[PDB]
Amino acid sequence: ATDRLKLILAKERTLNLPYMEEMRKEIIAVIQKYTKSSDIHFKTLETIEVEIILP
Template identity: 55%
Template sequence: MNLWENIFKSKKSSAQEAKDRLTLILAHERAINVPYMEAMKQEILEVIKKYTKAQKIDIKTDSNQDFNTLEVEILLQK
């Protein structure tokens, strides 16, 4: 799980914030044809918003030659 330690540690601004955060990552190779990806992402985000009543959701998308990724960081309500 060093992967997660690295991801969380590289981003946290305080210990408290780190504890109240969920991270979701969705990834696929660019070569796949997934015409429904946008709609599916939106629906997954709706589910997360509904449950977490999130204060703040940060969404990052990234792509390179091989992969497309969606990274969602949710600051949870206290």
């Protein structure tokens, strides 16, 4: 009933981004207001994984 988008943020388990999850955040703000997706799943794999589903 609908197509889907996926943003995967990848990096090394080595780094310490004292601002990672915020980047993990603001970035989303950029996809929802442009894709208008109500449905979103973020989970970790280090590799954050955000799957969007559109309207």
